[PDB]
Amino acid sequence: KEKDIQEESTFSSRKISNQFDWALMRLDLSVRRTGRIPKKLLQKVFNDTCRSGGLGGSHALLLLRSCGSLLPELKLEERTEFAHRIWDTLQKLGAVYDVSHYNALLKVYLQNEYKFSPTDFLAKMEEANIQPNRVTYQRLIASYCNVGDIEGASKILGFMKTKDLPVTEAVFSALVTGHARAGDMENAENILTVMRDAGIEPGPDTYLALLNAYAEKGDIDHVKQTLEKVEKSELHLMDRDLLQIIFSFSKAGYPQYVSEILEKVTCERRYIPDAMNLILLLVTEKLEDVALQILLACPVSKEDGPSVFGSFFLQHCVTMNTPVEKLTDYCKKLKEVQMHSFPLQFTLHCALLANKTDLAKALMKAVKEEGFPIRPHYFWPLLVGRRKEKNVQGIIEILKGMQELGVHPDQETYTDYVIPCFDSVNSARAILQENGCLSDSDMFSQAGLRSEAANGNLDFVLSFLKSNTLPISLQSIRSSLLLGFRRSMNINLWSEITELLYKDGRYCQEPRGPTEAVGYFLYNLIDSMSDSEVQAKEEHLRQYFHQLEKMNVKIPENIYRGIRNLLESYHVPELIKDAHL
């Protein structure tokens, strides 16, 4: 697009260094639409941050905060490794880490269940020699509470008094978590009473920790009690709180109560992305059966049933190596509700991008049972993958899988994939002949002919045609040859091959006209050659047409008119003269 207006002046000069804010939106918009930031997308923003080089403390802070619960697709450990890698990269780029930066790292650690000694991180802060703040101390208490260390938590709170820091609701929520995680439900209930005694009415976060506490132990009776209290109380109802309880039950290993808690889920203003994130997390946790229950409870897009709120589930199931039965079962349910017209095919695509033949074969065989038309184009990307792998037996297994399904590789399959992959075309056919898999190896021999014709080795083209005993197609050679001529053109070659032809000509009989069609071949060639290219082929064309006169195999008159018209467009007198002769 004329340089895309210099990408709109390199994207308006990167928003005058505010691209980072612009990128914050693309991130935020993804959370609004999906609730998840695609790993790829984040890598782009991060890679763009390194590309830009100029980082901002807040901008680097965002990336760190993005590595926490905002990556439901990735496992907790992968999030931490990612976060660690970013932190290091940010430091290599000269990121001045303030209290905020280290605080965000604590949140990421806490969100990703990254177990660490609160003393070690405090020591990291001491090496930086940056005074910690309340949030740091509060999050360090949460770290000690996530591990159920009440004594440590109380000791940090004791120092908190020396610093004179206000106790926030987050502190009380963390206290509940610790006693719940330690199994002392009575103590966790005492926090609820002490909070009321201190005059701080328990918040819905504190109740979510209470709700989550019960889910960990599987005390559905208490879950129902605290639920009813929340319903009765002024406390609004957020599905992000509820959806989190299913995760607790799911993570706790009581999916029977999940169904009960899921039934409690009432579709509200905008919690699709949260359920979208939960479903992703469940498949990450290999709890696809529960994810399916939630997936079915989600509302189908009003405009189109075939909405992609199962695509993110299917794709992540494929990425997670969900059992073929499980994955296929999910696709079937999506196909039944019209949630996907082509669920399996889409899974086949991403599974093909993963470059796994075993899955592709099973999925492809499930495409035939579903009744969608199979095509070699389905196996085509997979063959590309193995071509890069250079696995002689691996690619052979693809052909066997295609036979099981009934697909047969045509010529285009070889020329595009099997022909380039194998070091030698003739050795490839020999290995393929050893297997006996190919319905016909002539298509392979012809495939090498195309490549050598396309490459312009017209000498090979002719010599090949002779040796081979099976029939070949001339018209296809003509179109491939005129391409080869543009690639490799030698006047001497055309004469040499013609003399070679006279020596040991095979077949002899041709349905293609001895001379009338030879003209058609020349006409098609001239038409393909660009005016500038034909101008360059001025001296040689004259000689070739003088050779035509001495041979006396004049071209057809009707085709002659065609050529002459092409030469008039070129406006070169030598070419027009060549036609007259």
Partner: protein, 435 residues
């Protein structure tokens, strides 16, 4: 002639019933009269206007009188189509309005300025597509507007800016191009125009910064400009401008915004009540934070109660400003005013006052005044109207009152507080016991 009366009286039902009866009799109804009937029907959506006595969703209904009458019309001029398109857009019939505009083009009929303004909103709301697509669609309507020799009015540009609010990330720079186009053409941006821009340039709810600096250019332009009512959204500017001044925490910018409000008759654009309270809440909160206490107290006297009645949170901000300024001799006055403004029983405010008074020791005179205010706050806790439901004595409040009595020398009164602690199960801090 008798039907025209009902149209002037805005009797949607009587006019339709009479119009049908007129049509059944076979008497000729002038196109102008029928056009006036459509205007009345299209504007109100075939619903009786609210009378003295006898939101979500699309109000346009397929089986409406306007559609039936529209087809009945033997001759349909440009105005009949225009008012019908405008009615559909007004009533959220975006797809139906665009379809009617297509029919309008098929008849080779030039649309007026007002139809084009409504159509811009339709394209944005009707379909859901990327900004690039919507922007191309909007630009296409502008190109159609030029082809038909239709001159754009101020509303044409204000609707674009309002419509572009959805696409915050992508419309920022395009929105400036629209503003720059207005200045070249000669359409003078009203307050609504700038209101839409400053909103557009500060949409993200994430902690972002330096995107709101758009305002500085706008303020320099608007400095000392007497405004007249041009767009129905002119009243929303000041509230938005003051909200940005609070976010940027720039007191000098706030005084420039307020200065503009006071010039000439600009104060009349503050808007309805809830607009005025929000404006003054954000304005006064910024003064206490970013200005000297000596000037804050002057603004406090001038604005309250003449201008607005303070929210309980603004009284807390004022108390915090007095603390930072180390001017705690005024705290007793703040309590008196707080009670006069209906904050006698605000738990948050009562707790804050007591804590500040008891935080540190003060001289005998200041300690006595705090004891009297504490005794008054104590009386308010005793006479709570929440008592009907449940009377709560926050631990902190009880402790602060007892300490303030002890420090002032009213031991008799402090001794009584000990019974309350155990009564209410409130743990006294060591400081109270040590003292």
């Amino acid at each position: 002639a008798a039907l025209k009366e009902r149209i002037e009286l805005r009797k949607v039902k009587a006019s339709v019933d009479m119009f049908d009866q007129l049509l059944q009799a076979g008497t000729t109804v002038s196109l102008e009269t029928t056009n006036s009937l459509l205007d009345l029907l299209c504007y109100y959506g075939d619903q009786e206007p609210s009378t003295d006595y006898h939101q979500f969703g699309v109000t346009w209904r397929a089986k409406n009188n306007a559609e039936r009458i529209f087809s009945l019309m033997p001759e349909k001029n440009e105005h009949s189509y225009c008012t019908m398109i405008r009615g559909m857009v007004k009533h959220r019939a975006y797809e139906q309005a665009l379809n009617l505009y297509t029919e309008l083009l098929n008849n080779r009929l030039h649309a007026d300025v007002y139809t084009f303004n409504a159509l811009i909103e339709a394209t944005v709301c009707a379909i859901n597509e990327k900004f690039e697509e919507k922007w191309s669609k909007i630009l296409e309507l502008l190109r159609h507007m030029v082809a038909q020799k239709v001159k754009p009015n101020l509303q044409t540009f204000n609707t674009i800016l309002k419509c572009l609010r959805r696409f915050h990330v992508f419309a920022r720079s395009p929105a400036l191009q629209v503003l720059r186009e207005m200045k070249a053409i000669g359409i003078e941006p009203s307050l609504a125009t700038y209101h839409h821009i400053i909103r557009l340039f500060d949409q993200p709810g994430d902690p972002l910064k330096r995107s709101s600096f758009i305002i500085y250019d706008i303020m320099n332009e608007l400095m000392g400009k007497r405004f007249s009512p041009k767009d129905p959204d002119d009243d929303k500017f000041f509230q938005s401008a003051m909200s940005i001044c609070s976010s940027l925490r720039d007191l000098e910018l706030a005084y420039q915004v307020h200065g503009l409000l006071k010039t000439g008759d600009n104060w009349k654009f503050i808007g309805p009540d809830q607009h005025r309270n929000f404006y003054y809440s954000k304005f006064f909160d910024l003064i206490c934070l970013m200005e000297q206490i000596d000037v804050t107290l002057k603004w406090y006297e001038d604005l309250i109660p003449s201008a607005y009645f303070p929210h309980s949170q603004t009284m807390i901000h004022l108390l915090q400003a007095l603390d930072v300024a180390n001017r705690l001799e005024v705290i007793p006055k703040i309590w008196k005013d707080s009670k006069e403004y209906g904050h006698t029983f605000r738990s948050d405010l009562r707790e804050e006052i007591l804590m500040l008074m008891a935080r540190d020791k003060h001289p005998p005179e200041l300690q006595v005044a705090f004891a009297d205010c504490a005794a008054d706050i104590k009386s308010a806790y005793e006479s709570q109207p929440i008592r009907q439901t449940a009377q709560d004595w926050p631990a902190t409040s009880l402790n602060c009152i007892a300490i303030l009595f002890l420090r002032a020398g009213r031991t008799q009164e402090a001794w009584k507080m000990l019974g309350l602690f155990r009564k209410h199960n409130k743990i006294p801090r060591s400081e109270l016991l040590n003292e």
